[PDB]
Amino acid sequence: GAMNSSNYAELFNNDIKLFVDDTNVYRVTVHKTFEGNVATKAINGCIFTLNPKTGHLFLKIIHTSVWAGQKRLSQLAKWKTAEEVSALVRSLPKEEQPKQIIVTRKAMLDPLEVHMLDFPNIAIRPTELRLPFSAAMSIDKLSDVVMKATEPQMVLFNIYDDWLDRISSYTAFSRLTLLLRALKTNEESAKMILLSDPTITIKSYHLWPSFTDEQWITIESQMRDLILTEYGRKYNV
Amino acid sequence: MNTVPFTSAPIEVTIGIDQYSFNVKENQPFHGIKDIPIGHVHVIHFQHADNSSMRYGYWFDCRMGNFYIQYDPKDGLYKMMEERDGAKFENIVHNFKERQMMVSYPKIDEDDTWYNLTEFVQMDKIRKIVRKDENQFSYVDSSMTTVQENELSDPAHSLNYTVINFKSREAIRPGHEMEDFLDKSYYLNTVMLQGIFKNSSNYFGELQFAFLNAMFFGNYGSSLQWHAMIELICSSATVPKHMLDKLDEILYYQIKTLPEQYSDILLNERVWNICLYSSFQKNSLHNTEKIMENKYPELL
């Protein structure tokens, strides 16, 4: 059934699984019309489909053209997400197909289940975890490729850069969730922390700065401090 | 007006005949039920005083043969049997009627309740849902599972209701996933009505039979089937107007007849709230919505 703190290690076993997050699929700016009414203007979105074991990200860019002339876009977005995930699984060779897909939002379960009826051996699961994958659009290079897209496009990334050379998936996923939780809670502070020291660069083929092991400990500490402060302010405690 | 004579009543039992019921004492001189209206199916049902577990009974049509009940002290139940000897039968019933040993099917002249509950139910369709082809009558009880229930364990003793599953390839055309899931008209009209039932009369017959098995035997799988067939129509944007009108009448009489104290287990909150207040047909069931609101406002 549901993925939670109890079964957290299952993410890093040898069963291929994907997380699917649909929180950035349908994105709008709300604005005033000339007549003083409110209208939305969609901007480009993305499906965030992540192998938590390998760090492989299947970033399907959702171009604003997919919403042209469509009604009930927040509902369509869930079905569009399920159609694209289904398309992705069918495009993979059998031995690369996930055995499980975990949706970050429960509203994705029925749309994905219906789109995956051809795959009765692929388990579709919710999670009780509050995963910060919505902050994926706070990663500059992911945001950049989404906003520049002029057509539907799949872009492949390793969201762990080269980390798996030095750390386990479990540790790489904890670092990722800590960076995304920080970016989600206070984007300005989190981005300040990551770039401040100018000697530390992002390699052309990476998303995050090239930090030594010791520089990562310092960065991770600064991210936890950011998250606890903001939590104090949120709840005056 | 036909008769279902009884050999005897050796055990104390509540006897049902359609929507009516009588208490019979152990060894009470009871020899059956007379004046049963010709032209409808009927159900004769039983709850032992000693074991309020297992309600059970027999769907039958008096036009199809001469049926009697005899207690079997080995299997411990009242069994329906057919008497092929027409003149032995008439002679037994004549004696029992002369000795006034038979209760009279107690139909009020003005009262169309049974007709309204059984309008589309035919013995020939019952016998395909309940397979025991050597008998003209169909046994049902509280415990019998449905073919669908068995898929999720004795095939012979199953209720072979039409499988309905909203998250099945049968229900969802490839490339019409969102359309077919959110609007089940394809599944209702093409797969079920034209494909499997052939017409709305057969669909309604199965729906009505599922309700009566739910109500008279507390058959849980029957109740699931009744709700599934209601929900498939209510979740369809495109339903013939005559089907919507007739559904409103069917459901009205089902809700009218339901014992007030069984609404908690026999009515699915989600299905009814969805059918009356959210669905495509939320405004197509005036009679059903008014009786549900006035009789079961808590469920909603």
Q: Which domain holds residue B138?
A: 1-143
B51 and B84 inside one domain:
yes
Which residues sit opposite A61 in a β-bridge?
Answer: A46, A153
- B180's CB contacts (< 8 A; 6+ apart) are B171, B172, B173, B186, B187
Which one-letter DSSP state was computed for residue A37? -
Report the residue count for chain A: 237
Which residues sit opposite B56 in a β-bridge?
Answer: B46, B141
What is the phi/psi pair of residue A67, to 5°? -90, -5
Rounded (10°) angle between helices B200-217 and B220-234: 140
B162 and B191 inside one domain:
yes
B152 and B300 inside one domain:
yes
**Pairwise CA distance, residues B24 & B47, whole Å:** 10
Q: Give me the number of domains chain B comprises.
A: 2
Contact of A192 with chain B, judged by CB distance below 8 Å, is answered with no
Residue A46, token pair as written in the block: 């993305």
- Residue ranges in chain A assigned as alpha helix (H): 73-91, 109-115, 140-148, 169-185, 187-195, 213-234
Contact B167, A112 (CB under 8 A): no
Contact of A109 with chain B, judged by CB distance below 8 Å, is answered with no
Map residue B259 onto helix, strand or coil.
Answer: coil
CA atoms within a 13 Å half-sphere pointing along the CA-CB vector of A48: 25
Q: Residue A143, exposed/middle/buried by CB under 10 A (0-12, 13-18, 19+)?
A: middle
Cβ within 8 Å, pair B177-A110: no
Q: How many CB pairs under 8 A join A and B?
A: 23
Q: Which CATH architecture has domain A9-163?
A: 2-Layer Sandwich (3.30)
Cβ within 8 Å, pair B168-A117: yes
Which residues sit opposite A52 in a β-bridge?
Answer: none
Among B86, B74, B72, B78, CA closest to B17: B78
Distances (CA, A) of A181 to A49, A131, A227, B46: 18, 8, 7, 64
Q: Where are the domains of chain A?
A: 9-163, 164-237
- B268's CB contacts (< 8 A; 6+ apart) are B223, B227
For every residue of B110-164, which 3-state class applies, written as one string? CCCHHHHHHCCCCHHHHHHHCCCCCCCCEEEECCCCEHHHHHCCCHHHCECCCCC
Which residues sit opposite B104 in a β-bridge?
Answer: B34
Map residue A100 onto helix, strand or coil.
Answer: strand
Residue for token digits 């919403």? A67
**Pairwise CA distance, residues A91 & A89, whole Å:** 5
How many other C-beta atoms are found inside a 10 Å radius of the C-beta of residue B220? 18
CATH number at residue B42: 2.60.34.20
Superfamily of A164-237 according to CATH: Prp8 RNase H domain, fingers region (1.20.80.40)
- Declared resolution, Å: 1.7
CA distance A115 to chain B (A): 6
Residue B66, token pair as written in the block: 């001469």
Of B167, B168, B177, the CB nearest to A79: B177
Cβ within 8 Å, pair B172-A82: no
Which one-letter DSSP state was computed for residue A165? G
What is the phi/psi pair of residue B69, to 5°? -115, 140
**Pairwise CA distance, residues A29 & A32, whole Å:** 10
Residue A190, token pair as written in the block: 């989190």
B131 and B69 inside one domain:
yes
